[PDB]
Design an enzyme around this catalytic site. Structure first.
Site, mmCIF file in Angstrom:
data_model
loop_
_atom_site.group_PDB
_atom_site.id
_atom_site.type_symbol
_atom_site.label_atom_id
_atom_site.label_comp_id
_atom_site.label_asym_id
_atom_site.label_seq_id
_atom_site.Cartn_x
_atom_site.Cartn_y
_atom_site.Cartn_z
ATOM 1 C CB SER B 36 -0.859 0.265 1.735
ATOM 2 O OG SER B 36 -1.479 -0.625 1.096
ATOM 3 C CG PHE B 102 0.762 4.061 -18.669
ATOM 4 C CD1 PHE B 102 1.660 2.477 -18.916
ATOM 5 C CD2 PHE B 102 1.383 4.883 -18.598
ATOM 6 C CE1 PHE B 102 2.708 2.650 -18.201
ATOM 7 C CE2 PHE B 102 2.680 5.205 -17.932
ATOM 8 C CZ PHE B 102 3.079 3.991 -17.745
ATOM 9 C CG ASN B 195 13.740 5.926 -34.750
ATOM 10 O OD1 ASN B 195 14.155 5.245 -34.892
ATOM 11 N ND2 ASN B 195 13.198 5.978 -33.076
ATOM 12 C CE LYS B 227 24.240 15.116 -34.786
ATOM 13 N NZ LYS B 227 24.380 13.921 -34.675
ATOM 14 N N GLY B 256 6.939 11.950 -31.236
ATOM 15 C CA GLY B 256 7.432 11.262 -32.655
ATOM 16 C C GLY B 256 5.716 11.707 -33.315
ATOM 17 C CG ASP B 257 2.295 10.176 -30.999
ATOM 18 O OD1 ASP B 257 2.550 9.356 -31.731
ATOM 19 O OD2 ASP B 257 1.934 9.790 -30.309
HETATM 20 N N1 LIG Z 1 15.821 17.746 -28.653
HETATM 21 C C1 LIG Z 1 14.698 18.460 -29.725
HETATM 22 N N2 LIG Z 1 14.741 19.825 -30.125
HETATM 23 C C2 LIG Z 1 13.450 19.672 -30.397
HETATM 24 N N3 LIG Z 1 13.539 19.535 -31.286
HETATM 25 C C3 LIG Z 1 12.781 17.683 -31.466
HETATM 26 C C4 LIG Z 1 14.267 17.177 -30.518
HETATM 27 N N4 LIG Z 1 14.107 15.993 -30.374
HETATM 28 C C5 LIG Z 1 13.078 15.478 -31.465
HETATM 29 N N5 LIG Z 1 12.710 16.547 -32.045
HETATM 30 C C6 LIG Z 1 11.410 16.386 -32.931
HETATM 31 O O1 LIG Z 1 10.882 15.171 -32.487
HETATM 32 C C7 LIG Z 1 10.898 14.720 -34.253
HETATM 33 C C8 LIG Z 1 10.560 13.354 -33.806
HETATM 34 O O2 LIG Z 1 12.142 12.754 -32.509
HETATM 35 P P1 LIG Z 1 12.494 11.499 -32.121
HETATM 36 O O3 LIG Z 1 13.450 10.908 -33.888
HETATM 37 O O4 LIG Z 1 12.953 11.130 -31.218
HETATM 38 O O5 LIG Z 1 11.125 9.987 -32.902
HETATM 39 P P2 LIG Z 1 11.058 9.264 -32.037
HETATM 40 O O6 LIG Z 1 10.189 8.241 -32.878
HETATM 41 O O7 LIG Z 1 12.328 8.375 -31.447
HETATM 42 C C9 LIG Z 1 10.343 9.883 -30.236
HETATM 43 P P3 LIG Z 1 9.117 8.987 -29.392
HETATM 44 O O8 LIG Z 1 10.095 8.689 -28.264
HETATM 45 O O9 LIG Z 1 8.019 9.466 -29.091
HETATM 46 O O10 LIG Z 1 9.153 7.581 -30.427
HETATM 47 C C10 LIG Z 1 12.105 14.940 -34.513
HETATM 48 O O11 LIG Z 1 12.024 14.898 -35.623
HETATM 49 C C11 LIG Z 1 12.245 16.060 -33.830
HETATM 50 O O12 LIG Z 1 11.851 17.460 -35.603
#
Ligand SMILES: Nc1ncnc2c1ncn2[C@@H]1O[C@H](COP(=O)(O)OP(=O)(O)CP(=O)(O)O)[C@@H](O)[C@H]1O
Ligand SMILES: Nc1ncnc2c1ncn2[C@@H]1O[C@H](COP(=O)(O)OP(=O)(O)CP(=O)(O)O)[C@@H](O)[C@H]1O
EC number: 2.7.1.20
Lengths: 323, 323
Positions: B36, B102, B195, B227, B256-257
């Site tokens: 708990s 979740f 990715n 990047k 990412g979404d």
């Molecule tokens: N530190 C940062 N600053 C600004 N933008 C970022 C960032 N990191 C990610 N992004 C933006 O988000 C996009 C998608 O992020 P990422 O490449 O991490 O996908 P992913 O699918 O690994 C995230 P998830 O964990 O949600 O699946 C990148 O192409 C970029 O435009």
């Protein structure tokens, strides 16, 4: 005829895990766990002692105001209670906290992992019963249900300040309070509700004899599980009423709450002590036979038949006549 | 201009435990626990990949239909999305299961105890996209977001049967599917989103060369975290767009979404590939700078200023002109 019910308002979020927690726990890095359980089932029950009692009173057709603290996420629960005749005007809604929540996951061997989120519950100490009295006049009775400890004291003191009859429900907090703190919940009570073990504890902790308590209160109600209930007047008259026989022992949660609600509904409806405890006993068995605490149905004909079977046709007719 | 978003719909219920789970776990009877935790805080976030994407598209003023499975407890979430312009007519509401959930409790040392309740999610396999097509006509695009695996396949097959352009989002399921199963999610796609790591995995598992994939799909979109992103056409032209600089790295959930949603909103609004990825990058950073996934705000002037700062005034003016 208005009963003001003070006490906790909560929901219970219950999940079933098909496997065994041990199989994930045993190999775990106990110093920094990362446990993920894929669960099978999710059931949500409306609860908290004040919610349960208000629900039962409303369903039985009594006049009831729920007086406790919740969050903005109380809206659906409010709707549910208002549909059963419950006045929710004096539920304090927190600006910041959600409604209290108990979340529990149970595995195939009945192991449990639970969280309790108090949320808006400690804000009950900010409720003024004078606001209820302004809006609807003096309640016939104020139930001091298990709550935030400080809120229980403040509500009891305010009942004294305003001249309101109150019911002491010292149960859940007896083990945790000093004898002096317990005395302050009891002094001047219209009713005292405990079970038999709690009654013996109350006496030991307060340093009070039974005679001492009976000069403080108007009626002791002591519940005895399947052995029924004792009702003791300050004159030394005792009434024992036996239970309504169960056909299911499904879920004993909320059974004490339902007894109180049925008994006090009886009282507000003008029934004597014995008839009121007979009604209380019926509501109690209906909760015993239901999973959760407000998931039971009120069937007038079925109630009449069951009361008749337990207590005779004469008792049953007198009881049902008040709804 | 209507984007139909398929995928998971869920909420996340997150609680903070002030102490250390270890202090309760270490002494425990691990073969039958009764844990708990008294928690401090409860935060609820609306989520699921389809919910997150629909939200972002709606907020940006795009035309969007959410197509996924939830429970009757989806009602408030529906209201929230409808307020942001999201069509929820084709959310399947389960008769029996609640919306996927979740639930996670985190302690002071960042140890975690979580449950996942799939609930109504496996019912997405019972959705017919032909019903969407009857009601609103052929969507401009159907996003095949992470979902019940079988639902992802059925939706992809139906897009083929009905002649609907679809976006393959094979991410979350690449590690779990066979190469042949992965191929069936990819064949005929208008867009493929992954990715960089997932892209290399997709190739290895399918037994496909890049050339093989580019003859199956119209555009590869490969995200690279800080990047930026690569956009690769079947002609061998590559466009790389760098990120919008963050002022906070608060919460990378949903980033990412949000990129996908912003990029595809751009596309539906008639923007080219580079301008669309610049918009995607802005939406992504706004989610990165917010706790949860739909808790971010859309400020037109702030967007214009930030896009200008990252990509120049010319790019910014062209982008904002489409809202
Ligand atoms: N530190 C940062 N600053 C600004 N933008 C970022 C960032 N990191 C990610 N992004 C933006 O988000 C996009 C998608 O992020 P990422 O490449 O991490 O996908 P992913 O699918 O690994 C995230 P998830 O964990 O949600 O699946 C990148 O192409 C970029 O435009
Ligand atoms: N097996 C049974 N069959 C029918 N009625 C029962 C019952 N057990 C209890 N009841 C009814 O409920 C009343 C209160 O039950 P009990 O004495 O167990 O209180 P309690 O406060 O210990 C329950 P809780 O665990 O909810 O606090 C009894 O007086 C009786 O009327």
């Amino acid at each position: 005829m208005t009963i003001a019910v003070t006490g906790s308002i909560a929901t219970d979020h219950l999940m079933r895990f098909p496997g065994r927690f041990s199989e994930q726990l045993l190999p775990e890095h106990l110093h920094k766990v990362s446990l993920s359980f894929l669960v099978d089932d999710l059931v949500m029950h409306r609860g908290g002692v004040a919610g349960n009692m208000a629900f039962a009173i409303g369903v039985l057709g009594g006049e009831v105001a729920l007086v406790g603290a919740a969050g903005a996420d109380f809206a659906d629960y409010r709707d549910w209670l208002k549909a059963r005749g419950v006045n929710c005007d004096h539920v304090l809604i927190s600006e910041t906290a959600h409604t209290a929540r108990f979340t529990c996951t149970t595995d195939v061997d009945m192991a449990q992992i639970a969280s309790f989120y108090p949320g808006a519950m400690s804000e009950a100490r900010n409720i003024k019963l004078a606001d209820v009295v302004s809006a609807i006049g003096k309640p016939e009775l104020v139930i001091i249900g298990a709550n935030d400890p400080e809120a229980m004291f403040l509500h009891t003191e305010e009942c004294r300040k305003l001249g309101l009859a109150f019911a002491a429900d010292p149960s859940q907090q007896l083990a945790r309070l000093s004898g002096e703190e317990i005395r302050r919940l009891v002094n001047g009570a219209a009713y005292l509700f405990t079970n038999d073990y709690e009654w013996d504890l109350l006496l030991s902790k307060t340093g009070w004899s039974e005679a001492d308590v009976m000069a403080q209160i108007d009626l002791r109600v002591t519940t005895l599980g399947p052995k029924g209930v004792d009702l003791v007047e300050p004159d030394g008259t005792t009434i024992h009423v036996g239970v309504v026989p169960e056909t299911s022992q499904t879920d004993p949660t909320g059974v004490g709450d339902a007894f109180r609600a049925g008994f006090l509904t009886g009282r507000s409806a003008g029934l004597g002590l014995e008839r009121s405890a007979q009604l209380g006993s019926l509501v109690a068995v209906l909760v015993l036979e239901s999973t959760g605490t407000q998931e039971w149905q009120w069937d007038y004909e079925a109630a009449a038949s069951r009361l008749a079977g337990a207590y005779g046709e004469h008792a049953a007719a007198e009881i049902v006549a008040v709804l």
